[PDB]
Amino acid sequence: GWGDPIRLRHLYTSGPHGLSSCFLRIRADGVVDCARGQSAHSLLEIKAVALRTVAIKGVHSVRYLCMGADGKMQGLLQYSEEDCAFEEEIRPDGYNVYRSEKHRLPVSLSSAKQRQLYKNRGFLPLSHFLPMLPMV
């Protein structure tokens, strides 16, 4: 389908309120964690499901990026629109945020303690992403 582009990207975040630089990695066991560099399981496939809404699937884990309660990120093999579809919003400064409408939270690599510490701040750490091309 050539109606919308299929993008292949690595997602990379250093902030806000971040410590190190992180590549979003979807491991085969479903865990979503920080990768210090570009790896096979940090390679993401990005396709539109609505106009500005996006689904994100790790190509080597073939797990969709899905959000749980309080904003926890997990990789599930079965897509569900309410948990794994996000509005992609590109900020004026060039960073991409992926808001979940159901959970009212952005995709982030914050820990569970960080997500609770910031749950009423209007932003989560490690939620501003730069989309990087893969180096063959």
């Epitope: 389908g1 050539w2 109606g3 919308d4 582009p5 299929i6 993008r7 292949l8 496939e45 590109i90 060039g94 989309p131 091309l133 063959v136």
Partner: antibody
Framework: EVQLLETGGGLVQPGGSLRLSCAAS????????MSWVRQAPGKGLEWVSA????????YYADSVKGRFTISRDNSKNTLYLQMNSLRAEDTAVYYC????????????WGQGTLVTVSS | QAGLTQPASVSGSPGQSITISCTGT?????????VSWYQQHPGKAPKLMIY???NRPSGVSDRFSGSKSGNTASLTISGLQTEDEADYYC??????????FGGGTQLTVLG
């Protein structure tokens, strides 16, 4: 590293036919879309046609629909553009371009093969 | 049914900064975030310099930056160096017309 070798360029008369081939090497050819982008001498770039990666989806520009045919064969890692009903406006260097995925964003380019349509 | 509009020529001296505009419509530059910029030196293949409006592939110098406002995308090259002299083509995604290009801009580094 990654290499795209276009072949089949030369002189053809208006109304003739010619098929271009692109020798892909250095990547899993079957996983990425491909495209042909052409450039008339001393003029700008024009995207010609696109292929899905598996062959199932093809995309064409208005200036070549019905006359050009994009095709692939993943066994031999080769991309095809069969140009029929050639006109003078098809005179261009024809570039073989690898898609980053299926987004019409071009990772790598061949050095192009020139197609001259003159009588 | 028309390509994107770029200025035919842009020129600056070494060390200066320049901007190349790329005007489209609400169906291309102003309708998506998939504006790309390519650099083409004489007799060579185009080279991807900017993708998705503002992002740089690895190796591309950080003197190149892309941005967009309404229907106009812009490529900016700070600290002009001699080798920056080339042709620059912007490109945008479209829903039903494939990849549409701009007419190209010849960048001259006045030496």
């Amino acid at each position: 590293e990654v290499q795209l070798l276009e072949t089949g360029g030369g002189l053809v008369q208006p109304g003739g036919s010619l098929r271009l081939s692109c020798a892909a090497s250095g990547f899993t050819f079957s996983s990425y879309a491909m495209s042909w982008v052409r450039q008339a001498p001393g003029k700008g770039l024009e995207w010609v046609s696109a292929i899905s990666g598996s062959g199932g989806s093809t995309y064409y520009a208005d200036s070549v629909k019905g006359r050009f045919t994009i095709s692939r064969d993943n066994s031999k890692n080769t991309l095809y553009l069969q140009m029929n009903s050639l006109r003078a406006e098809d005179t261009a260097v024809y570039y073989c371009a690898k898609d980053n995925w299926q987004e019409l964003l071009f990772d790598y380019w061949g050095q192009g093969t020139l197609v001259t349509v003159s009588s | 049914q028309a390509g994107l509009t770029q200025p035919a020529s842009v020129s600056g001296s070494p060390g200066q900064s320049i901007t190349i505009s790329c005007t489209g419509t609400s169906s291309d530059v102003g309708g998506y975030n998939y504006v790309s910029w390519y650099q083409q030196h004489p007799g060579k293949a185009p080279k991807l310099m900017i993708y998705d409006v503002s992002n740089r592939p690895s190796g591309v110098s950080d003197r190149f930056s892309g941005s967009k406002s309404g229907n106009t995308a812009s490529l900016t090259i700070s600290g002009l160096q001699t080798e920056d002299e080339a042709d620059y083509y912007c490109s945008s995604w479209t829903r039903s017309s494939g990849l549409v290009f701009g007419g190209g801009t010849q960048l001259t580094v006045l030496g």
